[PDB]
């Protein structure tokens, strides 16, 4: 047993914490399908803690990020019964979500690779936290928590990974899409006055403002929108004067 | 008398160049063209007094003091002497012809080595020998054997002893010429031989240690630089073999007389294993030379090989005979020295017991041999003669010797005559005078126990006689001897039975026991043989006849080598294995009672009784299992009694259960053959359960045992080959060491248990095997070079196991054979090339007969021609001789 964990370890640590070319790609591939389709979860301890190990203290380039995201995808997909017992989707999750110095140093105006593993990590981070039925999810007031106080305290990770692994974790778990949605009442003024800073990134915050206006326009909305027309006067009007609010809001919903 | 040897420009290159400055004592000898041996060298000038003259290059002949050019006046003149010192000349000293005797001169001529010097190990650190040490060359020489003339330019002889200085660049040195050290060493007072006149040019490190302990790794069981030496490491090792070689230095250096060294430490070479060199212990000037085997199975192993070695050294090195033919002498010393301290360090086996084994496989190993005295001459022969019989012969030798009277005048004679020989006559020893002073201040005679018992000896009869004398108590009894018999003169030229080998009979030992075997000695003188003797003042048989008088049992030395032959051999067995206070007649009654007849249920219970037996030690316990195994049904099969009890008794672990598995396990599993059912479940169980109970670090008896185990069950029980699911028990065994053999040889590391499974596998299947993927797979493995020790075991197991087609199979192995030259890859594709195609072509002359016939029929591909033309140095004399034996 000891030695057989030891050598499968090993070997893919050479491998998979390696790196080739021509058969980069099919050895990753092959890897990652033969761990998530055969073998068994003995070596679940040793993979989490040398992935989290190398991913708390790496942080360098997109490539590791993707190797790592992908692996730890495929692993988590088709794994056994030791991922909930273990617990990674809070540190891994929480880390993936945090990251900004990776993109920025490695790449940091045009992340493409940022975005894209924005958004991969919103979906497994999303599907662990939904995958719970009595109690196998209970960090939605921590993640809330710390989303407000990293919004309320500065900067970190802006302006994409908090909404996405926010939105993802939300929308995934909402089996309190009303209440992650809402939270207060005047936010977006308050957070984008807050924060500025003098973003001179017109298109990212106006790509944000969209997408946020997009994934926050469903049954509620349909029925009030065609028995009335999404309130023009009553958003208009009343409620408070948030130019991008009320002008994304109204923009994506003409 | 003399000698200055500058050697250097020898790593790097794989060379050695560098001037010679011989300072003559010789004082006579022959001068002038003097025959100085070399090899394939370069020679570089030869100047000598003024300028040079002719000479002769080549058997070196460089001709020197030929003409009257030189002056007489020096060798004419005497100078003033004192306590009777004399040193006068004559005709030879002065005269005026050539090829003068006692003259003093002093020679000088440069010579260089390349690396195509045969017999030497040049491996230089430039991209030709390994990732490890780039910085360091490897040009290992060997020095026991004819190394000096590929070394260098000299005699090679051995009836001309003297002395030379060892001041070499690689006293004290330290800064000299830039980054050299001129190592300066005077030894100008004790004088050597040529034989012994090497440079084995090894690593600079040097592991060597002390004798002070006590303890440290939980011990045990005027000093010198003792321990080994290695390349920065054999840490444990060298601490081991420090303690242990500490000891025994100490010991032997105590009980012995006097030694002229004190580096008393060994070396770990990279060009190990040899023949004659890295063979246990090698003896050069202060320093071993030892193989890889630091993490090997030692115990009695290592304890006998250490022993034999430093008593071989102590007792080759310090009397030097003008006869060559002191093997039974050295030999004979060794085998005491060694033998008195293992028994006075270990003791777990039973020395007596250990003793008496060895004795009997010398006997079995001896039964069928040559001659002892035979003719000298040059490594094989010497390494041939040195492991082969003549080490267990000196033994059997030395005891009787030894215990044919009192052991003062032994021990006496020898401490005392060590120290003439030793004091005044270090080369003109002599062997038969060594035995006639012995024979002649201790009794007397020994010539027909020396040459008789070196030529040859045997018995198979003995009678008894039982008379009972009422009239006057008188129970005479008689004893006769009888026996059934039905290169040494170019292997036995002629022939002879003997007739009678053994010419004295010696002594004849009584021991008659009295009722319910008692402990009653005698002592019989007999001398002639053929006499008689005479003596005075369901168990219905033992129940009818309990106690009748004395049953006088079998012995004392076993002066002809002894088989036992009397009446009551059921009483006689089972009294003497059940009441004896002697580990040797215990030994012998149980070995008697074990190939002899007696009860079932009786013998099994005595048996187990006695093998577990606190008692008892590895001898007594693997006797009884032996006996047992042998003799498992009084007239049936299988013994559900000790088969069952062996089985329930075997389910820090030490030498009893490390002894008992091994041979419950290769003796366990024997024929069976029938019950596939029951013989899978058994040893599949054992197989696949081993060690599931006391797992741990001592794997090596397991893994030997466990392969010599599942071998005889797959090759005894599968010799014949699914009514029991026999093939399927066969696949699933060779899918079981396929798989483990991949997988230990693979994301793994061993080599103490992978070769003994391959050949245990190999040699359990043989015929009725894959045919054919043998020679691809070890062509695969040996092109590889997977694991230091796995091509030749696949090169040998390949060469020995095929036979069938052969197409090519000739061209493919002498490529490889010579392609492949190293250590092991050399001197076991070597010996096991020869070996492995002696032993699968073939009384001896019908058997040469027929290897000479099928070398006819396939006398197509030699080579001889090649095979011939690229040996050289040690495969060069052997190929030569081997190579003339087999044309």
């Given at each position: ?254 | 008398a003399h000698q ?18 011989l300072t003559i004592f010789a004082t006579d000898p022959s001068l002038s063209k003097v025959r100085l041996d ?23 002949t460089v001709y020197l003091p030929e ?8 060798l ?16 030879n000293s002065?005269?005026?012809?050539s090829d003068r005797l006692y003259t003093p001169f002093v020679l ?46 000299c005699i090679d002889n051995f009836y001309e002893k003297y002395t030379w ?26 004088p050597?031989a040529a ?232 080369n ?460």
């Amino acid at each position: 047993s000891r030695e057989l964990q030891l050598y499968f370890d090993k070997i893919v640590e050479v491998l998979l914490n390696q790196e080739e070319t021509k058969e980069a790609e099919l050895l990753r591939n092959s890897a990652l399908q033969s761990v998530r389709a055969d073998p068994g979860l003995q070596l679940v301890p040793y993979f989490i803690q040398f992935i989290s190990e190398t991913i708390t203290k790496n942080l360098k380039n997109i490539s590791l990020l993707s190797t790592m995201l992908e692996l730890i995808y495929s692993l988590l997909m088709n794994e056994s019964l030791f991922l909930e017992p273990y617990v990674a989707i809070i540190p891994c999750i929480l880390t993936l979500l945090l990251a900004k110095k990776i993109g920025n140093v490695d790449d940091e105006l045009q992340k493409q690779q940022q975005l894209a593993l924005r958004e991969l990590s919103a979906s497994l981070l999303e599907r662990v936290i939904e995958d719970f039925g009595s109690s196998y999810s209970t960090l939605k007031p921590r993640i809330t928590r710390t989303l407000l106080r990293a919004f309320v305290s500065v900067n970190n990770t802006t302006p994409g990974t908090q909404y996405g692994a926010l939105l993802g974790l939300r929308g995934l778990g909402s089996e309190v899409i009303r209440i992650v949605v809402l939270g207060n009442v005047i936010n977006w003024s308050s957070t984008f006055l807050e924060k500025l800073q003098q973003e001179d990134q017109v298109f990212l915050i106006d790509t944000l403002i969209e997408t946020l206006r997009v994934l926050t326009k469903g049954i509620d909305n349909e029925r009030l929108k065609q028995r009335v027309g999404d309130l023009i006067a009553d958003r208009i009007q009343a409620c408070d004067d948030a130019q991008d609010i009320y002008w994304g809001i109204f923009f994506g919903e003409v | 008398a003399h000698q200055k040897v500058q050697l250097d420009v020898d790593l790097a290159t794989q060379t050695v160049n560098g001037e010679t400055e011989l300072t003559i004592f010789a004082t006579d000898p022959s001068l002038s063209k003097v025959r100085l041996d070399a090899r394939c060298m370069q020679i570089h000038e030869v100047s000598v007094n003024l300028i040079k003259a002719n000479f002769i290059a080549a058997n070196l002949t460089v001709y020197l003091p030929e003409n009257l050019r030189l002056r007489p006046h020096d060798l004419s003149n005497t100078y003033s002497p004192v306590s009777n010192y004399n040193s006068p000349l004559t005709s030879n000293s002065a005269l005026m012809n050539s090829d003068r005797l006692y003259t003093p001169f002093v020679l000088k001529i440069n010579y260089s080595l390349r690396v195509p010097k045969n017999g030497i190990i040049f491996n230089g650190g430039s991209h030709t020998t390994i990732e490890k040490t780039q910085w360091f060359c490897h040009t290992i020489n060997n020095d026991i054997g004819c190394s000096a003339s590929s070394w260098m330019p000299c005699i090679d002889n051995f009836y001309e002893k003297y002395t030379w200085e060892l001041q070499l660049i690689v006293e004290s040195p330290h800064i000299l010429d830039h980054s050299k050290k001129v190592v300066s060493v005077q030894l100008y007072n004790n004088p050597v031989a040529a034989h012994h006149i090497g440079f084995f040019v090894g690593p600079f490190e040097q592991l060597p240690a002390s004798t002070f302990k006590f303890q440290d790794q939980s011990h045990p069981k005027a000093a010198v630089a003792a321990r080994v030496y290695f390349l920065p490491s054999q840490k444990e090792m060298v601490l081991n073999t420090c303690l242990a070689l500490y000891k025994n230095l100490d010991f032997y250096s105590k009980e012995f007389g006097s030694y002229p060294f004190s580096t008393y430490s060994m070396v770990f070479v990279d060009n190990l294993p040899t023949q004659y060199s890295s063979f246990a212990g090698i003896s050069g000037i202060s320093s071993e030379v030892l193989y890889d085997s630091g993490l090997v199975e030692p115990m009695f192993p290592v304890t006998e090989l250490l022993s034999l070695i430093v008593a071989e050294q102590w007792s080759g090195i310090n009397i030097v005979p003008k006869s060559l033919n002191d093997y039974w002498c050295v030999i004979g010393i060794a085998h005491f020295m060694a033998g008195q301290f293992l028994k006075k360090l270990f003791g777990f086996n039973n020395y007596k017991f250990v003793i008496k084994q060895r004795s009997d496989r010398i006997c079995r190993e001896d039964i069928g041999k040559a001659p002892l005295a035979n003719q000298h001459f040059r490594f094989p022969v010497n390494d041939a003669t040195d492991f082969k019989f003549i080490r267990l012969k000196a033994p059997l030798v030395l005891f009787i010797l030894d215990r044919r009277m009192t052991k003062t005048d032994r021990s006496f004679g020898l401490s005392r005559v060590i120290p003439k020989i030793f004091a005044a006559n270090g080369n003109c020893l002599s062997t038969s005078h060594f035995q006639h002073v012995c024979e002649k201040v201790a009794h007397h005679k020994l010539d027909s126990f020396f040459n008789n018992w070196v030529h040859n000896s045997g018995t198979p009869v003995l009678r008894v006689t039982q008379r009972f004398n009422k009239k006057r108590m008188f129970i005479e009894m008689g004893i006769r001897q009888v026996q059934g018999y039905e290169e040494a003169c170019q292997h036995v030229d002629q022939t002879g039975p003997g007739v009678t080998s053994q010419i004295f009979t010696g002594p004849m030992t009584i021991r008659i026991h009295e009722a319910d075997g008692t402990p009653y000695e005698h002592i019989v003188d007999l001398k002639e043989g053929f006499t008689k003797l005479d003596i005075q003042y369901a168990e219905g048989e033992e129940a009818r006849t309990q106690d009748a008088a004395e049953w006088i049992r079998i012995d004392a030395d076993f002066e002809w080598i002894c088989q036992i032959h009397l009446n009551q051999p059921d009483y006689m067995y089972q009294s003497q294995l059940q009441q004896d206070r002697d580990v040797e007649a215990q030994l012998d009654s149980v070995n008697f009672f074990s190939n002899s007849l007696r009860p079932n249920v009786f013998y099994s219970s005595v048996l187990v009784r006695t093998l577990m037996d606190n008692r008892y030690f590895y001898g007594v316990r693997c006797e009884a299992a032996k006996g047992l195994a042998r003799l498992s049904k009084e007239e049936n099969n299988h013994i559900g009694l000790h088969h069952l009890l062996k089985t329930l008794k075997q389910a820090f672990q030490r030498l009893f259960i490390q002894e008992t598995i091994p041979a419950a396990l290769s003796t366990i599993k024997i024929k069976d053959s029938d019950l596939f059912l029951n013989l899978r479940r058994i040893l599949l169980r054992l197989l696949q359960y081993n060690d599931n109970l006391n797992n741990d670090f001592n794997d090596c008896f397991y893994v030997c045992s466990l392969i010599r185990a599942l071998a005889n069950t797959i090759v005894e029980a599968g010799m014949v080959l699914l009514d029991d699911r026999i093939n399927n028990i066969n696949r699933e065994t060779v899918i079981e060491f396929n798989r483990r053999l991949q997988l230990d040889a693979a994301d793994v590391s061993y080599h103490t248990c992978i070769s003994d499974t391959i050949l245990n596998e190999k040699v359990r299947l043989g015929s009725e095997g894959l045919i054919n993927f043998r020679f691809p797979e070890l062509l695969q493995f040996t092109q590889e070079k997977y694991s230091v020790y796995v091509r030749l075991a696949g090169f040998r197991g390949l060469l020995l196991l095929g036979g069938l087609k052969n197409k090519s199979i000739l061209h493919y192995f002498f490529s490889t054979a010579k392609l492949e030259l190293s250590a092991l890859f050399k001197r076991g594709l070597i010996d096991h090339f020869l070996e492995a195609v002696g032993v699968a072509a073939l009384x001896x002359x019908x058997x040469x007969x027929x290897x000479x016939x099928x070398x006819x029929x396939x006398x197509x591909x030699x080579x001889x021609x090649x095979x011939x033309x690229x040996x050289x140095x040690x495969x060069x004399x052997x190929x030569x001789x081997x190579x003339x034996x087999x044309x």
